[PDB]
Enzyme design. Structure first.
Site, PDB file in Angstrom:
ATOM      1  N   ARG A   1      13.086  -0.420 -11.105  1.00 56.72           N
ATOM      2  CA  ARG A   1      13.890  -1.618 -11.278  1.00 56.72           C
ATOM      3  C   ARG A   1      13.653  -2.177 -12.665  1.00 56.72           C
ATOM      4  NH1 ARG A   1      15.716  -2.925  -6.055  1.00 56.72           N
ATOM      5  NH2 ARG A   1      14.349  -2.167  -4.381  1.00 56.72           N
TER       6      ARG A   1
ATOM      7  N   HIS B   1     -10.979  -7.617   9.550  1.00 55.85           N
ATOM      8  CA  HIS B   1      -9.723  -8.171   9.062  1.00 55.85           C
ATOM      9  C   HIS B   1      -8.783  -8.542  10.186  1.00 55.85           C
ATOM     10  CE1 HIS B   1     -11.174  -6.063   5.410  1.00 55.85           C
ATOM     11  NE2 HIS B   1     -10.630  -7.097   4.794  1.00 55.85           N
TER      12      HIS B   1
ATOM     13  N   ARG C   1      20.689   1.661  -3.025  1.00 57.46           N
ATOM     14  CA  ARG C   1      20.583   1.400  -4.452  1.00 57.46           C
ATOM     15  C   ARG C   1      21.810   1.881  -5.190  1.00 57.46           C
ATOM     16  NH1 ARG C   1      15.279   0.962  -6.582  1.00 57.46           N
ATOM     17  NH2 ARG C   1      16.217   0.800  -8.669  1.00 57.46           N
TER      18      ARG C   1
ATOM     19  N   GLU D   1      -8.914  -0.238  11.206  1.00 59.33           N
ATOM     20  CA  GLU D   1      -9.533  -1.131  12.158  1.00 59.33           C
ATOM     21  C   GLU D   1      -8.970  -0.892  13.549  1.00 59.33           C
ATOM     22  OE1 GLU D   1      -9.914  -5.099  10.536  1.00 59.33           O
ATOM     23  OE2 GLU D   1     -11.056  -4.318   8.820  1.00 59.33           O
TER      24      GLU D   1
END
Ligand SMILES: [Cl-]
Ligand SMILES: [Cl-]
Ligand SMILES: [K+]
Ligand code: NA
Ligand code: NA
Lengths: 250, 251, 251, 251, 251, 251
Positions: free
Chosen positions: C165, C5, C220, C77
């Site tokens: 949310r 990847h 928040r 990786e």
């Protein structure tokens, strides 16, 4: 010579039955209801006496509070030949007309503990040995106690797992919010802390166990038990458990 | 108000906001005497409670008994009485080859193999210590001269099957725990004990500061038997360390 | 030789054993340029990879994308290529009223509201950072002059329902997450993010050292919108801090 | 409204109610150019967004990145902007020996080895595609000359241990996943990928239509790392297929 | 009111507050005829319902079909019509070497390997019989001269994999149940059947009295498919026992 | 050679590889008689078994009883005797307002509110039909002229609490199922029934092809009661549809 209990097989003088209260102070009290009570050891939450009942050795060993230390005591006593375990405890009534001083014999426990899972997966029933439950019921009824047979919610905490709110945070985790009424509606009689572990461990390990407990508070009223009635309730419960022991020995 | 299990009042604690919480009642006085003016407060069940003074500040020492459930009671009842910081001390068995008897372990997180932690937070919540406590414990442990390991502890509701012991009455370990020690070993877990998951989860989710330090007294992976002297020094060191960690917390 | 990847080789890393891992590929170059001799290595998918030098030592900067799953690929990786220390940096939204925009959060443990962590350790295992990394991040963050919070972060596999949310397409939140923000707030959880549970669990169970530091860019519980300068300052501080944490980690 | 991550408005989508959602941002333009009047809309993080027209109807092409978490963000934000049908075109590893590299697999249901799906529906809920989408995908695959398989997909939050890959840094796979590939194979599961459980569960529980078609780039009967040589061709086939599947959904 | 499935009314039951509930519809008449004035009430699907009289009191006999789900319907609908006590008489496979075909087992608790029990109480709740019923069943069993065992029953939603039978179409048993029979054997479990977990959990959590007595028709240490030869006589003994147990409950 | 519960042999099935599996034993003959040369094979417990011929091919009709457990037995034993395709037919009550009495529902996936499915695959596995069967059922249902809904079915081990019915003996529903009907409604679930999760999971994990089709005979959300004629027509259409689906599955 066992790791925690500090007793040897020889110390037990052939006992194959243990009475296992939670409170170390109750051990001597129970032992003195029998013949030739002898102090064996006291280490941590484990106070151990032996006594004789109808000529047979009985070991009395406190478990401390909770499945974890209970599991240690049961294991180590089983290592020394004990096969029958009678818990005598204190308990809070969930049902409104189960009163302080009544005795509750557990027919099965709601496993609100962790230690039971170390012996059997959750699907396994926290159920007493039938002979022990029978002996406990008989001893309780013969004693003239007000006795209830039924399901006990057995919690790893005294506070939030028994839906107590009069606490430092006043919070109860979601799982336990509304739980007391749920158990009440489901016919659960009482809360205590060790029967789920004890019954599951024993029922899955070839050991015979039961739990009888004296009601020291009615939780439909309040959260902290009144002190005044503790001693009398305890005295009644230990009279009962010793008689249940007699019935188990023959 | 006298708390139900511990049998002490807020006044008994003389303003203490920190508690050292060993498992064994007999260790309470031993810890308290490392401090100034130790006074016995109460002993009920597996709860022996002393107060002492550390650098002029009141400190409580209170045994918890074995296991999360009784620990949770002590922590709660002390919290009701104003205690906000809880330092667990004890000795432990390591499951890593590189951890020797005499070493100290400061828990950075616990594998929640207990039940009581779930009564405070769902399983997803991390059983982690307060960072200041862990930091103070590491420093105190290092200052003692011991080799210190910071890492994960597996916190089991049982001494026997949950620690994958087979030398037991039945010799059986439930499926869940079969192979578990090797699993934890491979995951870098340092040791087993029986209270930290409950203690850390309860405190971290309740606005309380907690940590755990332990002297290593045995290693599941080593055949060698530690001598009496090393064990005694390790027990003594563990409590010297926790008291020094408390001093760092109160500074 | 070339990881599937990330598209880089061990040689590309020039001996780096530490990676800084932001979420956003566009941030990678910025972080690398804080250090010496930044070199672009590769960009594929959400993985932009740079190398740079810090006090003469090679450091990798590699974006992870949003979420545990893509993070787990980058960490694995990089680990195959010799990276052993992973420093998550980013910005975050706090859920505690006392945590202000511009503050730094260093994660002491994560609530595992993710799936990938379970692919490394069962839920009981704590999503805990390496103590040295957390210590280095705390030191770097404090030295920046910012107010620093050490504590638990809630690590969600979603941005929307898992962070409770409701301003969404369905307006629904599954039962599991209904009331969850308040629950985490009451448990002292500092913020939501979407990668730490995976990162920390994976590393803590795989012999890798990891930690997370985040600058707070929104809260928040607050209605005020931070100004552009404050946001820019906070972003800049977050990456300066992680590079300083890297410096402290380097041997 | 401009959605938070994707950086597009409903007006930008020109009435599109269908999205093709590849995981790889580089695949977006490749898909868009198979349609009419492709326009780049935005690129932020792993989200590259194009619009194009198919038989006169607007279609959005939006990458998701790797993983349920970033996928869930893209789907939600597109749904906020009116998109109702989501066609994932991915890459996948076959876990049945008869499936060849280059084949297409259309998921009829996913094993939910992810975390994000649980943020939309409890585990009991089936990660199932919309039947029209699955039907369109099958037909499109056949009509494009592809070899196509219909069946169950194991959808994992990791590429490595959750797909039981052992050629990794630690070489370990957590208990849960040990033997899992053979178990899924025995159960007739066709393939592994990472996003379908999240996508299908999210959509099936939210009034959105979804499906997943993926090009087989590896057969796990042979190896763990996909061969590079066949990637481009397999991808090209998959995008031809997904565009024709989109055409069938719009008819 | 006529209940939806059973097709009987409260009046039909003539004041019965106790039901004997075999699984096999053909067993209903066989049980009813051991009592006085047996009358067929209804037969619909797996539910054959008779009424009879025992010591002058009405008793219902109602088959449940195989499985917790159909059992749960019968128990609910009978409870709606005033029945408060439920005595299951079934067939069972013993898993303990010492238990013989023809023996009776009175369940003291069930391993909940079913799904319907969870529709009444969470898994923690014990699948436990009413103590009076279990007591009555034991005494009835003994007084019939049969060989009776008190103990735990593993109650499975399947006959095949959940009882770890391998002589099946696939010959496979899902991971959860691999080795499960030995696990239950080692835990002292006496037998397998399919309805007791549901029945006992439902009743114990609903203010109903229930118990289960079952005739051992196979020992699973020997084989997987019960021999036909001993079925009839084992059934005959079981029903004598359950009717006498009913007599004791009505006393 | 004679399966334990069904009481039939392979020879009895005359080479049938497809079974139609209604719940109600009384419906078996009715279904069989839609085809050619229906032959009664056996009736034991909830299992009534017929054979008939459809376009010259033998087809089994076998009732399952109510619930996954008895269904799992029938499917297994028929599979032992060579049956590979299982078509569930029945009638059902819808929970969506837009679904009308007389419409057909073809299940694309089931919410696993059962226990028996777990005896075949862990919960993460999708309770999904075979695509060919679902395709055939959709085609048959649509060719009937009925409005057809392809979607998710909630498959409950109970008729009462698991379908959130309160008009019951206790009048309560365990926490898990409180508010569950609205939850499933909001998630787009079409209906409740009691066997599909087990059937679909068992088959999809065992190399068997299965699907479910049902005529809607009532709507939980509508107060209007359908008349006898409409119910009769819907019952008739449902079995005509499943027979035509069988025709489509055959060669
Ligand atoms: Cl109490
Ligand atoms: Cl792959
Ligand atoms: K204790
Ligand atoms: Na991503
Ligand atoms: Na049935």
């Amino acid at each position: 010579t066992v790791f925690h209990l500090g007793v040897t097989e020889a110390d037990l003088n052939g006992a194959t039955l243990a009475i296992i209260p939670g409170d170390p102070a109750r051990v001597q009290k129970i032992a003195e209801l029998m013949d030739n009570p002898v102090f064996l050891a006291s280490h941590r939450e484990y106070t151990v006496y032996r006594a004789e009942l109808d000529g047979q050795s009985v070991v009395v060993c406190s478990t401390g509070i909770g499945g974890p230390s209970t599991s240690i005591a049961v294991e180590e006593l089983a290592q020394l030949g004990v096969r029958t375990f009678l818990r005598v405890g204190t308990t809070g009534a969930i049902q409104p007309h189960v009163n302080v001083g009544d005795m509750i014999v557990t027919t099965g426990s709601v496993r609100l503990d962790g230690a039971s899972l170390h012996f059997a997966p959750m699907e396994f029933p926290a159920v007493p040995d039938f002979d022990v439950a029978t002996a406990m019921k008989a001893a309780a009824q013969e004693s003239g106690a007000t006795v209830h047979m039924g399901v006990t919610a057995s919690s790893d905490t005294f506070y939030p797992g028994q839906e107590r709110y009069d606490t430092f945070t006043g919070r109860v985790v979601r799982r336990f919010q509304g739980s007391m009424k749920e158990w009440q509606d489901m016919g659960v009689l009482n809360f205590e802390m060790e029967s789920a572990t004890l019954l599951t461990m024993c029922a899955s390990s070839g050991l015979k166990a039961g739990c009888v407990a004296g009601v020291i508070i009615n939780r439909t009223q309040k959260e902290i038990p009144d002190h005044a009635t503790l001693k009398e309730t305890e005295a009644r419960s230990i009279k009962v458990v010793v008689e249940a022991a007699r019935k188990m020995l023959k």
